Design a protein around this ligand. Structure first.
Ligand SMILES: O=c1ccn([C@@H]2O[C@H](COP(=O)(O)OP(=O)(O)OP(=O)(O)O)[C@@H](O)[C@H]2O)c(=O)[nH]1
Ligand SMILES: O=c1ccn([C@@H]2O[C@H](COP(=O)(O)OP(=O)(O)OP(=O)(O)O)[C@@H](O)[C@H]2O)c(=O)[nH]1
Ligand SMILES: [Mn+2]
Ligand SMILES: [Mn+2]
Ligand SMILES: [Mn+2]
Ligand SMILES: [Mn+2]
Ligand SMILES: [Mn+2]
Ligand SMILES: [Mn+2]
Ligand SMILES: [Mn+2]
Ligand SMILES: [Mn+2]
Ligand SMILES: [Mn+2]
Ligand SMILES: [Mn+2]
Lengths: 531, 531
């Protein structure tokens, strides 16, 4: 069936949408080619609709059926509980879209009688009505990227589909305990979300070294959410039901699947009907768990169809990495094509055909890759890095415009061990915090699904806990990583690394001069700039 | 061993402590005998210390051992999970004591890097150190009561013992999932906290009617927290460990039991050492679950020792109700004494010897009792009520002084079906909200462990959901209930019910005149005042 059927009404914004990077001195201090940085807007919604709309054909086989039976068997060992209205309220993110019914996320979090009474009513309706399609809003996302001249130039806006806040809180009551425990049990070490950056690296490196002659590849599905079929969604529901659940939870899960997860009507910010969805909604509670389980099921089956040897998989939504025993150059190439044809039959064709890789550093998944450097004693240390283009573009954007979110702070924490986060992001932002004497002001930072209130002076402790002390002394990075960073700087018109090392020496001196916590940051975060 | 050993340092306050009800016109509008209303203060801490300090002797027998084996068997069917630091933070109550380490409940709730980093450090310490006694603060509670001339007059302040906020958040990571699920599984229908007031009544009435010749009694232990021994606390820990837990959870539960739950040093608000505890701390996460499990184990054993027939128990902490088949007047009296001697051997002697009752309305537990009235069709309706003295005294106190908590609102909701909440509390407070045009201002209300933000206009929907529509039309209350309310009014110098019915007619007219939501409250909340 068609992933979407549209009416013609447009996907409308609900606030101003900025698309250009504003010429700023501070921002130009970091990046000079401002014209290359842009943000998506509802203006390009049409192009996206075109890409995400297509008929899905799916043919399953015994490889698929076998893996699904194996997953259900593991699922049957899971026990999950219903969250109460109050627990679900307390776990609701602070900045989510307010309800059309007169209350917002803050009212939910504060257990307002208005929010609470309405949520009890939505819950009772879910249990008593298991058929009426539930309303969802469709919006264009506003995200920042760097232009890609080697093609479409600017990317069209991504689309987000979500139900009302009341329903979202009810999804948590029914499924929060399930989505936070089931994936790990079913998939084991292949469940990517259980790992911090260093643990992810550890799993990949140990897996890689365990093969006599390792071969690996990344796979990513073109418009994965659109490739998810009704049968895939019902299969997910059948997996949830294998768990030992409370009766109301079972009833609510079934109702949510029928009325919301399998599909339903799309409404724009104007209240007009935009169309109908027959695929994965990107803004529901089960989006991540569902996508990961489905990608894992199809990829596991595909590995069997392609007869890949001693496969080990790592899955984060539609992002897949498979490491296996090489069967030879031409044999591997042919096996990957068979793998891809199986994934295609199961409905998940790739954006770009996967390619066999014999160098772990060259495999990119979740927009990241493993790389190596050396610690103080000269020992090899593996860590997670990524191309710095998007992180840099977003940093310049946040430098030029106060943003409710500090993605740059999130990158500093997740990528603390990398050459670019240390030399460029840390130097750039601490220089700014010093100049504005806001070194002690807490900033909101979205990381791993949660919004934290982080005081910059806490960074050394945060990084130490997440990456370990060696994060402050890595040196001798790989040529491939150094060249990628250098090229990216040239492309974006950001000062070469020589300049950053010089600027970092100054920031460090300024931090030490203050003593206390500030000096601690100078000592640890910028020990690399010394001598 | 001794429940407490003291040093001599005093239990000190950390803010002003008011003990007298302030002569106020509005408050005197509700109650005239202001001199009878008082609040406890640290001044009487010494008297309490005396009462809660004593040697505990405990002799267990096969009845006890048998019940414990049965509980462990049910416990073994429970699976519980560790909460992450973030989940535990989000579930931390908004007004809990700030940490000595530089952050408070709001910082915890907002996932401040300061709170989060410290909590990770406390967690790591719990796992790596399983012996060092953890610090706790001891404070006198400030609560409002009505004088009891027939004895001690004024009651001494209760004492609360609690660890630092960081530790409290770690208790949730290790045990939140356990304390919210285990009691119900082990105890079934006897676990009192699973019931709303009406469900509690339903369970008691159906149990009562199921006996050929019902006999029942309430039991309450004198200073229960003090009667809990080290063996009782270790037995609780052994029950928790029967659950299918994560390795870190098991380690943290063991460490918390050794370093905190079994006992430890007491520090006052001044930082001075007040003494040492060898019994239940009143302010830990496991206080309620632990007390309920322990009371259930001792009472179950005691029922067997006393050979009570077809016993059915309801347990809320140390508050116990037992309903059984009468064996005759003198037989029941003798069996209750044997029951009490068994409870005493197990270490839990009663405040007042329990007495057999053959009238369900006369059994009071959790300061409450079942009573009957009639709905619109004249059908008998059972509901939960209580002596209105404390609720009234607190209402007058909150009328005279703005309070962070609106216990009166909590009583209106929990006791909506009662004659006194409807005729006195609702009338009194809506009259005030009207006069101050604050009918739409939300008030903080502590109910069932959570703090809600309630808009008065939401009361009809709240009451309907909790008690059902019949709550707005009950009439023909029992003589015993009517006389108790009438006597209490005489004792406190509050206007007789005739006056309230008259005052309610006025409030109702004023509400109807406004239309909308206000008129709804007039129609439902005060339909009893009509004609
Ligand atoms: O239009 C879109 C596409 C994707 N997403 C969301 O992006 C997340 C995946 O993040 P990825 O970084 O894996 O995106 P992707 O490009 O592979 O996504 P697809 O186009 O293949 O679906 C998922 O949580 C998905 O719901 C949107 O919110 N909107
Ligand atoms: O000094 C005290 C006594 C009791 N409590 C707390 O009161 C709650 C029980 O509430 P109850 O209403 O059952 O108190 P009680 O008088 O039976 O208490 P005991 O003296 O027998 O212990 C329990 O949660 C207990 O920790 C205090 O906080 N301080
Ligand atoms: Mn994709
Ligand atoms: Mn993409
Ligand atoms: Mn992807
Ligand atoms: Mn991405
Ligand atoms: Mn991407
Ligand atoms: Mn007691
Ligand atoms: Mn008492
Ligand atoms: Mn009690
Ligand atoms: Mn009480
Ligand atoms: Mn009491």
């Amino acid at each position: 069936s068609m992933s979407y059927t549209w009416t013609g009404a447009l996907i409308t914004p609900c606030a101003a949408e900025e698309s250009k990077l504003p010429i700023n001195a501070l921002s130009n201090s970091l990046l000079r080619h401002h014209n290359m940085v842009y943000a998506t807007t509802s203006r390009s919604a049409g192009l996206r609709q075109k890409k995400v709309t297509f008929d899905r054909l799916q043919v399953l086989d015994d490889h698929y059926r076998d893996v699904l039976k194996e997953m259900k068997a593991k699922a049957s060992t899971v026990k999950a509980k219903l969250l109460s209205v109050e627990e679900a309220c307390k776990l609701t993110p602070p900045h989510s879209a307010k309800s059309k019914f007169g209350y917002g996320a803050k009212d939910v979090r504060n257990l307002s009688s208005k929010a609470v009474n309405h949520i009890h009513s939505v819950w009772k309706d879910l249990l008593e009505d298991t058929v009426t399609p539930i309303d969802t809003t469709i919006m264009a996302k506003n995200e920042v990227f760097c232009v890609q001249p080697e093609k479409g130039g600017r990317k069209p806006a991504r689309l987000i589909v979500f139900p009302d806040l009341g329903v979202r809180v009810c999804e948590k009551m029914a499924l929060y305990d399930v989505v936070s425990t089931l994936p790990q049990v079913v998939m084991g070490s292949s469940y990517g979300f259980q790992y911090s950056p260093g643990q992810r690296v550890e799993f990949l490196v140990n897996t890689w070294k365990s093969k006599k002659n390792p071969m690996g590849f990344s796979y990513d599905t073109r418009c994965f959410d659109s490739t998810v079929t009704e049968n895939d969604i019902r299969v997910e529901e059948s997996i949830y039901q294998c768990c030992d659940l409370a009766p109301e939870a079972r009833q609510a899960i079934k109702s949510l699947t029928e009325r919301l997860y399998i599909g339903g009507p799309l409404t724009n910010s104007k209240g007009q009907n935009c169309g109908y969805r027959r695929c994965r909604a990107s803004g529901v509670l089960t989006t991540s768990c569902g996508n990961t389980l489905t990608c894992y099921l199809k990829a596991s089956a595909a590995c069997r169809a392609a007869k890949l040897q001693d496969c080990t998989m790592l899955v984060n939504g539609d992002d897949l990495v498979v490491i296996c025993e090489s069967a030879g150059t031409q044999e591997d190439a042919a096996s990957l094509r068979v793998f891809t044809e199986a994934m295609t039959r199961y409905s998940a064709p790739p954006g770009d055909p996967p390619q066999p890789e014999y160098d772990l550093e060259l495999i990119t998944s979740c927009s990241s890759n493993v790389s190596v450097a050396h610690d103080a004693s000269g020992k090899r240390v593996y860590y997670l890095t990524r191309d710095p283009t998007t992180p840099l573009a977003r940093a310049a954007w946040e430098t030029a415009r106060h943003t409710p979110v500090n993605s740059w702070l999130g990158n500093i924490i997740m990528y603390a061990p990398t050459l670019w986060a240390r030399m460029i992001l840390m130097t750039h932002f601490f220089s700014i915090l010093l100049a504005q004497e806001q070194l002690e002001k807490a900033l909101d930072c979205q990381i791993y699904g949660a919004c934290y209130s982080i005081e910059p002076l806490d960074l050394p402790q945060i990084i130490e806990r997440l990456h370990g002390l060696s994060a402050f002394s890595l040196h001798s990075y790989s040529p491939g990583e150094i060249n990628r960073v250098a090229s990216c700087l040239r492309k974006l018109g950001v000062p070469p690394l020589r300049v950053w090392r010089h600027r970092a020496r100054s920031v460090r001196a300024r931090l030490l001069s203050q003593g206390g916590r500030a000096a601690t940051c100078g000592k640890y975060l910028f020990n690399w700039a010394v001598k």
